[PDB]
Design a protein around this ligand. Sequence first.
Ligand SMILES: O=c1cnn([C@@H]2O[C@H](COP(=O)(O)O)[C@@H](O)[C@H]2O)c(=O)[nH]1
Ligand SMILES: O=c1cnn([C@@H]2O[C@H](COP(=O)(O)O)[C@@H](O)[C@H]2O)c(=O)[nH]1
Lengths: 220, 219
Amino acid sequence: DVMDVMNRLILAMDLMNRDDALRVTGEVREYIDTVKIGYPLVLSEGMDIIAEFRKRFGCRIIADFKVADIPETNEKICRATFKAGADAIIVHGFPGADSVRACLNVAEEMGREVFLNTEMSHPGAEMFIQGAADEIARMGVDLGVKNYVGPSTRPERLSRLREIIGQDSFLISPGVGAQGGDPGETLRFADAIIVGRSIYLADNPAAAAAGIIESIKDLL
Amino acid sequence: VMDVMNRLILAMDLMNRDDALRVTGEVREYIDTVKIGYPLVLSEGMDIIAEFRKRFGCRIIADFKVADIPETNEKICRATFKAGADAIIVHGFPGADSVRACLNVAEEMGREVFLNTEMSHPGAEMFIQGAADEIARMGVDLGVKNYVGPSTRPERLSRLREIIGQDSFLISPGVGAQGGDPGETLRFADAIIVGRSIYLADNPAAAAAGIIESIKDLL
Ligand SMILES: O=c1cnn([C@@H]2O[C@H](COP(=O)(O)O)[C@@H](O)[C@H]2O)c(=O)[nH]1
Ligand SMILES: O=c1cnn([C@@H]2O[C@H](COP(=O)(O)O)[C@@H](O)[C@H]2O)c(=O)[nH]1
């Protein structure tokens, strides 16, 4: 019983202008039904943008807020985020189990999902995150987390994450395209890929999305 | 370093504009520095920063625990400074590139970065504590001048002060509701952050005045 992402492709909509964000999302709407919205767009245009996306596209919204505070603050962040209409929120595991549990509680209260970020995809992740990543994944399993995020840029690490969480858990993966990750290789392990700049900075975002999907058509 | 009145920073985590403004107004004679985080910002919008600047003579620290990849961190910092925040708080666990991205924007934009080195809640023991000394040392190497460390662990706060040196600026949450003591915390931190002990009080002004009275010899 997991999220069903059209074409295994999640748009990372990190444009910071409302008109551009709506236009570009509109251009690729035939290809997706899931949009990841983060702080670049929300802090520039307000949390009301989430409801607007739902009104215009009916798409699922994952709030990529990298939640990383103490439990009582995490609870408030999740509540405000779900009140705005997000279907799911992404939370860091590095701050520990109590901080993750706070998010799980609010998600269960409001009919939403928590995604646990286990290993980030950028070079700096090697310094502290990578050494904790397997343990963070096991912590997710212990807590009953069913949704995870891991790195397209390190398919061996993404594979290990998939091993830890099992085939039943849901796994999404950013770092495809601009950061160097490959769509098809990433989908060997992840249920869905997250793609931002490769699509939203493209001269023709629709063609960019279509091209990515063409490259993975055998993977559905 | 920023000159924090009474060594006391209000953590304004009420989620309703009217309540947040009322409480902040009530304690304005005691503070000139307010920490605004996502509970309030996600409820009322980034224009809440503008509103606080208009209503109060307060510096604004945006406690956004910035914790993304460098390119996204840059965007978050730009949006936050554009809205009028004096400073932003960032995490170090995502690594040096992620911190450097924030520092670069702050330098370009004439604002400040605070690095959170060790959080004050129990879960911090699992992963954060073991990385904290290195995160602090990384901050020093990167040129970070402003830091956050935990009131709830005096021994850890003392070690973090040692690492960053006496010239760095250190603020510390976990005072009051989380169990930290104002006076003991100020042995090491330049200023204490206080939220619920003030903002949930029947009389927030009396609560702030009481905390200040308890540390008067340190002012
Ligand atoms: O470990 C990571 C790496 N990137 N991202 C996010 O995924 C998107 C990647 O976008 P991109 O395709 O433009 O690189 C951005 O929103 C970035 O913050 C994560 O959530 N986790
Ligand atoms: O390690 C920590 C612990 N708490 N906080 C923040 O400081 C405030 C503590 O508020 P309190 O006095 O109500 O506990 C809240 O905004 C919390 O998110 C931090 O930034 N870092």
